[PDB]
Amino acid sequence: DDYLQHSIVPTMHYQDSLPRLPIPKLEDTMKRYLNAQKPLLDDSQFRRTEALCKNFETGVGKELHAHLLAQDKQNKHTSYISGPWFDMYLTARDSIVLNFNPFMAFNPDPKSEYNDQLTRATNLTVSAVRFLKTLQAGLLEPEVFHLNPSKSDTDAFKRLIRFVPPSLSWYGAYLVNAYPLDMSQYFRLFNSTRIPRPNRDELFTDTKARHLLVLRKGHFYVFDVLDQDGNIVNPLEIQAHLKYILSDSSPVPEFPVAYLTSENRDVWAELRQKLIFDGNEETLKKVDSAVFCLCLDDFPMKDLIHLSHTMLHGDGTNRWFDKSFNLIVAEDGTAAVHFEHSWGDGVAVLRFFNEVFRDSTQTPAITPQSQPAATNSSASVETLSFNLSGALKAGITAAKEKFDTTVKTLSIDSIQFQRGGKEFLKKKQLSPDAVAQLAFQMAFLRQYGQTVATYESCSTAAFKHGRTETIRPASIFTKRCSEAFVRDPSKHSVGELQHMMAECSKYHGQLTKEAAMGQGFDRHLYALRYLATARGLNLPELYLDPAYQQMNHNILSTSTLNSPAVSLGGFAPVVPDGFGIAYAVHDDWIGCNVSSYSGRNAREFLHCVQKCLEDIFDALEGKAI
Ligand SMILES: COc1ccc(Cl)cc1S(=O)(=O)N1CCc2c(C)cc(C(=O)Nc3ccc(C(=O)O)c(Cl)c3)cc21
Ligand SMILES: CCCCCCCCO[C@@H]1O[C@H](CO)[C@@H](O)[C@H](O)[C@H]1O
């Protein structure tokens, strides 16, 4: 059948009974905010912030909190942060390229020849539509985080829970320490796009569409991957259409339209309207409503730097940046999912990503020896054409100048630390994630002699319409431990550094659990600011404090997702003087892919990260520094 999975439990079985996302006590948000400020502020900056905090907590903040709670109680079908968070993305006017869109790259097919570009593009594409079909059929297994997989993640639990009504099913999984996740974001994974509009962008979906959008040398192509009966088009026919696309010898267009999706959001909103005015609505509707966008690049990868540049931004001609995701397949079979961040988070993309990798490689639709179906692809496949006015052409030239000039200033480099990873760190009773994060704090002290605002993403998908919460890994413990390692290695014994590292780790683990439970401060303070603004009130003095603005000017912006499917990921910094740190602790090694603009140096930082991990592992091994 066309299904990559056959769950006896309906995909959506838990969604009705997911726990509502908790609003913290204002007193706890304030304390947690000040705790994260302690490592960042001089003493008089801190007392200034502490005083604004007390004024907020007793006054306008107390009142905002009261309304947020009452508003939440009116809207128990959703989460307090859902609207504000969507609005955060969609009102933002900056280019989504680099500011927002990340990538995750697949490991190769472990069968060498299956990495042929036509073979791999057909196989990945077909596994992606199989995902779509399985989700549509409610045959995708529900997302569940298990505390005791061996006992709750079992045929036997599944045969029982399927009988509990969705109004109560969450409770059953909870009672066996299993934690179902929100899956509402999968409504926008496919047939979906972000549409630029003034003020606030729009999220568009068209479930009725059956066609694929392919980009090659910046030419646009569509063909059906689902027939009129709802079945997947024969893979050997999909393979012929892809072969046919791969045979076009048209050079890159003089005005590649995809550039426009990299623009400032107001500029692009305006130019899109001109496109409609000049009669391109039908063409745009076909781009917008496609299952996803397949990008076919005609070069192989030179190295991981080249790979990261390619999957993160490319040359601007060959990604439709607005689309829910772009599935990229290069000339050497190197593939990745580049995605737009407003509609959903890493956790939902990861599931899709893991299922497609598994299916495409273990149950491939075609083989590298498959013969394409005899079929007339000039009938099946339409090459789209945009009617470009003089203003549209000038618009595209300007998009291209901005793209090229901004991209030139981006550097990305990586390290593979091979002394150890999870296995050694767990043996030492330390959280591996805390160790990675301490290394980044420590490397930055070494490189710049400062402690800076640090961001780590954490899913709150365990709750109804939960998104992410911010983990703030820069603490008084990472700061004191960094100072000990960098500023006076002499002063401390291996025992003391070991104990210091253990305190970082205990604090990190605490913030982690709190963030996953919705008990960080960032989302809560953001929702109060949002509410004040939406009510038409002046922005409260708390948010005008430079220490607040500084907390949200994230110089160290970090993220990790891990799975056997992912080789590496990448994203740009959020601020011009920042780093964008994609990392993973594996069983045996630690990988970081770091980005920076001109105002920082990724290469030196990785040298400092490398050095810091070696000192960390020595101290843990019993040696001096
Ligand atoms: C053994 O580790 C894992 C096991 C299974 C999985 Cl699915 C993921 C991981 S992990 O590598 O991704 N993991 C390590 C510790 C950790 C922490 C502290 C946070 C997160 C996390 O929530 N990541 C994350 C990062 C970014 C986003 C996003 O939307 O951008 C989202 Cl939803 C989530 C993952 C992980
Ligand atoms: C190792 C895998 C790394 C890729 C992670 C996929 C999700 C990345 O999401 C990224 O998170 C950052 C906040 O931490 C933001 O600054 C970026 O704009 C965003 O793309």
**DSSP string of 64-84?**
HHHHHHHHHHH-TTS-TTHHH
Ligand 1: does its nearest atom lie under 6 Å from the Cβ of 468?
Answer: yes
Ligand 2 mutation pick, 559, 566, 592, max ligand atoms within 8 A of CB = 559
Residue 303 identity = D
- The three-state secondary structure class of 405 is helix
Query: Helix 265-277 and helix 281-289: axis angle, to 10°?
Result: 130
Q: Which atom of ligand 1 sits closest to the CA of residue 354? A: 7
Order of strands across the sheet that contains 219-224: 382-383, 219-224, 211-216, 293-296, 325-329, 335-339, 103-106, 566-570
- Helix, strand or coil for residue 376? coil
For ligand 2, the distance from its centroid to the CA atom of residue 560, given in whole angstroms, is 8
Residue written as token pair 């504000």: 84
- Backbone angles phi and psi of 431, in degrees to 5: -65, 120
CATH of the domain at 583: 3.30.559.10
Alpha-carbon distance of 177 to 145, in angstroms, equals 9
Spatial separation of the C-alpha atoms in residues 400 and 51, rounded to whole Å: 48
Q: Which helix (H) or strand (E) holds 56?
A: helix 43-58
Distance 262 CA to ligand 2 centre (A): 18
Kindly report the CATH number assigned to the domain that includes residue 259.
3.30.559.70
Is there a single domain that holds both residue 398 and residue 439? no
Spatial distance between the Cα atoms of 413 and 505, rounded to a whole number of angstroms = 27
Nearest to 173 by CA among 339, 38, 14: 14
Ligand 1, atom 12, lies closest to the CA of 561
CA nearest neighbour of 263 among 273, 271, 274, 255: 271
Q: What is the DSSP letter of 23?
A: P
Q: Are 124 and 241 in contact (CB under 8 A)?
A: no
Alpha carbon 482 to chain centroid, angstroms: 29
Query: From the CB of 557, is ligand 1 less than 6 Å away?
Result: no
Residue that terminates a domain, selected from 552, 573, 594: 573
Q: Are residues 392 and 501 in the same domain?
A: no
Residue among 4, 15, 27, 1 at smallest CA distance from 519: 27
Whether 345 is in the pocket of ligand 1, judged by its Cβ within 6 Å, is yes
Identify the domain boundary among 128, 152, 180: 180
134 and 146 inside one domain: no
CB 562 near ligand 1, within 6 Å: yes
The closest of 551, 558, 596 to 577, measured between CA atoms, is 596
DSSP state of 301: -
101 lines ligand 1 (CB under 6 A): no
- CA of 100, nearest ligand number: 2
CA–CA gap between residue 298 and residue 247 (Å, rounded):
11
| HEC profile of 258-288 | HHHHHCCHHHHHHHHHHHHHCCCHHHHHHHH
Give the integer Cα–Cα distance in Å for 95 and 321. 10
DSSP-assigned letter for residue 17:
T
Residue 15 sits in a domain of what CATH number? 1.20.1280.180
CA of 406 from ligand 2 middle (Å) equals 19
Range of the domain at 432: 20-99+411-563+574-625
Distance 425 CA to ligand 2 centre (A): 24
Q: Which atom of ligand 2 is nearest to the CA of 560?
A: 1
Spatial separation of the C-alpha atoms in residues 105 and 307, rounded to whole Å? 9
Q: Going by CA atoms, what residue is nearest to atom 27 of ligand 1?
A: 346
Dihedral of CA atoms 507, 508, 511, 517 in degrees, nearest 10, equals -120
* Residue of 103, 458, 583 to mutate, ligand 1, most atoms within 8 A of C-beta: 458
Q: Is residue 120 part of a domain?
A: yes
Contact assessment for residue 179 and residue 144, using Cβ atoms and an 8 Å cutoff? yes
What atom of ligand 1 comes closest to residue 350's alpha carbon?
7
Please answer whether residues 331 and 80 qualify as being in contact, where contact means their C-beta atoms are separated by less than 8 angstroms.
Answer: no
Closest CA to 588 of 430, 422, 436, 416: 422
Assess whether the C-beta atom of 152 lies below 6 angstroms from ligand 1. Answer: no
| Cα–Cα nearest to 217, from 331, 324, 305 | 331
Atom of ligand 1 nearest to the CA of 433: 15
**Which candidate, 49, 386, 345, places its Cα nearest to that of 219?**
386
Return the closest-CA partner of residue 560 out of 475, 420, 462, 436: 436
Q: What is the bridge-based pairing of β-strands 454-459 and 556-559?
A: parallel
Residues 193 and 304 in one domain: yes
Q: What spacing in Å lies between the alpha carbon of 117 and ligand 1's midpoint?
A: 30
**Given its phi and psi angles, is residue 571 left (phi above 0), alpha (psi -120 to 50 degrees) or beta?**
beta
- Return phi, psi of residue 442, to 5°: -65, -45
| Residue 167 CA to its chain's centroid (Å) | 30
Whether 425 lines ligand 1, by a CB cut-off of 6 Å, is no
Identity of residue 124? L
Q: Ligand 2 atom closest to Cα of 103?
A: 4
Is 3 part of any domain? Answer: no
Q: Are 304 and 426 in the same domain?
A: no
Report yes or no: 21 and 463 within 8 Å, Cβ to Cβ.
yes
Report which bound ligand comes closest to the CA of 569. 2
216 Cβ partners below 8 Å, 6+ apart? 245, 246, 248, 295, 296, 298, 318
Give the C-alpha separation, 625 to 609, whole Å: 15
How does strand 293-296 pair with strand 325-329?
Answer: parallel
Closest among 142, 132, 187, 120 to 3, alpha carbons compared? 132
Instruction: Based on the fold, state whether residues 75 and 171 are members of the same structural domain.
Output: no
CA distance 178 to 145: 6
- Is residue 386 domain-resident? yes
The residue to mutate among 338, 457, 596, having the most atoms of ligand 2 within 8 angstroms of its beta carbon, is 457
Task: For residue 574, give the ligand nearest its CA.
Answer: 2
Label the pairing between strands 335-339 and 103-106: antiparallel
Q: Is 580 helix (H, G, I), strand (E, B) or coil?
A: strand
Q: Which of 158, 91, 25 has its CA nearest to residue 524?
A: 25
Does residue 153 form part of some domain? yes
Binding residue numbers for (R)-carnitine: 455, 457, 468
Examine the fold and report which residue of 132, 155, 180 is the final residue of a domain before the chain moves on: 180
Cβ neighbors of 291 (< 8 A, separation 6 or more) are 128, 129, 132, 190, 191, 209, 210, 211, 212, 213, 225, 226
374 Cα: distance to centroid of ligand 2 (angstroms):
43
Amino acid at 20: R
Distance CA 206, CA 305 (A): 36
Which three-class secondary structure state does DSSP give residue 328?
Answer: strand
**560 Cα to the center of ligand 1, angstroms:** 5
Q: Which residues contact 98 (CB under 8 A, 6 or more apart)?
A: 312, 313, 406, 407, 410, 572
Q: In what order do the strands lie in the sheet with 468-471?
A: 411-417, 590-596, 579-585, 556-559, 454-459, 468-471
Same domain, yes or no: 154 and 194: no
The ligand placed nearest to the CA atom of residue 340 is 2
530 shares its domain with 602: yes
- The three-point CA angle 615-616-619 to 5° equals 80
Q: Find the residues whose C-beta lies inside 6 A of ligand 2.
A: 100, 102, 104, 341, 346, 455, 457, 557-561, 569, 571, 574, 580, 582, 584
* 2 part of a folded domain: no
8 Å CB contact between 183 and 142? yes
Structural domain tally of the chain?
3
Known binding residues: 421-433, 455, 457, 468
Q: What are phi and psi of 383, to 5 degrees?
A: -90, 120
Q: Does 5 fall in a domain?
A: no
| CA dihedral of 117, 121, 127, 129, whole degrees rounded to 10 | 180
Structure tokens at 360: 């495409």
**Do 568 and 624 share a structural domain?**
no
Distance 102 CA to ligand 2 centre (A): 6
| Cβ contact 361:114 at 8 Å | yes
Whether residue 452 lies inside any domain: the answer is: yes
By three-state DSSP, how is residue 604 classified?
A: helix
Question: Is there a contact between 527 and 81 (Cβ–Cβ < 8 Å)?
Answer: yes
Ligand number with the minimum distance to the CA of 514 = 1
**At residue 116, what is the residue type?**
D
Q: Whose CA is nearest to atom 18 of ligand 2?
A: 100
Ligand 1 contact via 333 beta carbon (within 6 Å)? no
**Which atom of ligand 2 is the closest one to the Cα of 593?**
1
d(CA 104, CA 582): 10
CA atoms lying within 13 Å on the CB side of residue 508: 26
**Which residue has its alpha carbon closest to ligand 1 atom 21?**
458
How buried is 203 (Cβ within 10 angstroms: 0-12 exposed, 13-18 middle, 19+ buried)? middle
Catalytic residues: 341
Q: Determine contact, residues 184/465, Cβ cutoff 8 Å.
A: yes
Gap between the Cα atoms of 472 and 35, Å rounded: 10
Q: How many CA atoms lie within 13 A of 223 on its CB side?
A: 28
The span from the CA of 155 to the CA of 168, in Å, is 20
Q: Do 185 and 69 have their domain in common?
A: no
Residues flagged as binding site for CoA: 421-433
Residue 167 tokens, joined: 């109004």
Domain shared by 146 and 93, yes or no: no
DSSP class of residue 78 equals: S
The reply to whether ligand 1 has any atom less than 6 angstroms from the CB of 436 is no
The resolution, in angstroms to one decimal, equals 2.3
Q: What is the dihedral of CA 458, 312, 578, 445, to 10 degrees?
A: 70
Contact by Cβ (8 Å): 167, 17: yes
Helices (H), 303-451: 304-312, 346-362, 377-380, 390-408, 422-427, 432-448
- CA–CA dist 625, 620 (Å, integer): 11
Q: What is the maximum span of the chain, computed from C-alpha positions, in angstroms?
A: 76
- 89 C-alpha to ligand 1 centroid (Å): 21
Q: Find out whether 268 and 284 touch, Cβ atoms under 8 Å.
A: no
Same domain, 215 and 359: yes
Asked if residue 207 belongs to a domain, the reply is yes
Identify the three-state secondary structure at position 381.
coil
